[PDB]
């Protein structure tokens, strides 16, 4: 099966520069061109880049050309974007694709370049707690953070279940914020125990918190 | 620059509708045009490739036709995991270009939200700063009105709303809507509400605590 695995993504500042890799496996890499596709948040696909399976002829799109080199390794499978003199219109999710008898046959899960001179701050989590109710609902506050994205758990993963975390909103302050809820039989609140799982990579904060009145 | 525009640029349709969704070529890319589906917030999916060929593992309800400048994406009988938005990618020519995409979005009987407000936890005042957070949960369609009322007063500009993607079952929405204040600010009023008025309730519903109880 194939498996395209991203990295390198991550805060940049304006004029800074990252490396993308792009580690596949499950098929004859080597075999096929390789592309970067990118989407800045909110808009659609846009080709990046193409390296021949060879190695031989790269084709840029004029955005990136002179800042941006395509190149692959034979010997460990893996497709690099190195990226210089990055501006605000680069921040992007990257995703690398190999084409076969179609462009970008398969996908990447893709990594996110956000291109700031904002610092990373993490996220605060607080509860949004429960409860005459009926059957009702509670959850989390994830406030003030920065950069994209914090990932919600609920119960180490465990309750899936009528579970809505929803995308984040920035706010005045620049900081991102969002709320993660579920909804849960008036029942179970005095014996289960409800604990999010928030997770902040980008600062390497990971907060576990627990619910009510 | 090729350019390929797709049309419509979004719509709405039920379970078991036949979807089409074209895409124009600036000029003739013979059939060397890719159809691709993005899950929001995911990688993309491959569909279509050469116009009219079905790639691996995808349903047959999806196909494609088309050749030259005009081209076109079926999904004979939609199924509700099928909102997402669709691109078309021409690559006759570099640089290669997508279409903008279509988001698909299932359209299904209407459905009252169930609504919920959240005091700020006190492991927040004790921060200065105030969410009180509103919940719309599982309705459709996706238009709806939050009103926040603080002892009964209009507000403005202190709200913020974020809605949830189409549920793959069962097609709803959810929203929440967030209202900032001082420390200081809460606690000179009382009467916290939210209002919703939505298509499914007869009149606007109110979710209400008071600051004490």
């Known amino acids: 099966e194939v498996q395209l695995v991203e990295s390198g993504g991550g805060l940049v500042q304006p004029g800074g520069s990252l490396r993308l890799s792009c580690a596949a496996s499950?098929?004859?890499?080597?075999?096929?061109?390789m592309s970067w596709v990118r989407q800045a948040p909110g808009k659609g696909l846009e080709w990046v880049a193409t390296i021949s399976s060879g190695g031989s002829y790269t084709y840029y799109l004029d955005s990136v050309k002179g800042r941006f080199t395509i190149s692959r390794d034979s010997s460990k499978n893996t497709l690099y974007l190195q990226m210089n003199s990055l501006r605000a219109e680069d921040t992007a999710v990257y995703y690398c694709?190999?084409?076969?008898?179609?462009?970008?046959?398969?996908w990447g899960q893709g990594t996110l370049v956000t291109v700031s001179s904002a610092s990373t701050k993490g996220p605060s989590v607080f509860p949004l707690a429960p409860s005459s109710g009926g059957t009702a609902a509670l959850g989390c506050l994830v406030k003030d953070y920065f950069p994209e994205p914090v990932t919600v758990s609920w119960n180490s993963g465990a309750l899936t279940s009528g579970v809505h975390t929803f995308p984040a909103v920035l706010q005045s302050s620049g900081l991102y914020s969002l709320s993660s809820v579920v909804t849960v039989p008036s029942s179970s609140l005095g014996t289960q125990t409800y604990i999010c799982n928030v997770n902040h990579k980008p600062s390497n904060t990971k907060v576990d918190k627990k619910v009510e009145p | 620059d090729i350019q390929m525009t797709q049309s419509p640029s979004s719509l709405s349709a039920s379970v078991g509708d036949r979807v089409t969704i074209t895409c124009k070529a600036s000029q003739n890319v013979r059939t060397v045009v890719a159809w691709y589906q993005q899950k929001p917030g995911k990688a993309p999916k491959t569909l279509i490739y050469?116009?009219?060929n079905r790639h691996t593992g995808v349903p047959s309800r999806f196909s494609g036709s088309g050749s030259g400048t005009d081209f076109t994406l079926t999904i004979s009988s939609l199924q509700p995991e099928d909102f997402a938005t669709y691109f078309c990618l021409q690559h006759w020519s570099y640089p290669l270009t997508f279409g903008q995409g279509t988001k698909v979005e299932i359209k299904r009987t209407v459905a009252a939200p169930s609504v919920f407000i959240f005091p700020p936890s006190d492991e927040q005042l004790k921060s200065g700063t105030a969410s009180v957070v509103c919940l719309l949960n599982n309705f459709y369609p996706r238009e709806a009105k939050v009103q926040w009322k603080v002892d009964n007063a209009l507000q403005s500009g202190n709200s913020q709303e974020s809605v949830t993607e189409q549920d793959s079952k069962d097609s709803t929405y959810s929203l929440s809507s967030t209202l900032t204040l001082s420390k200081a600010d809460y606690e000179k009023h009382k009467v916290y509400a939210c209002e919703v008025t939505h298509q499914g309730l007869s009149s606007p519903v109110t979710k209400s605590f008071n600051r004490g109880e």
């Open positions: 050469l116009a009219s």
């Open positions: 694709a190999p084409t076969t008898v179609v462009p970008f046959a398969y």
């Open positions: 499950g098929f004859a890499f080597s075999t096929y061109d």
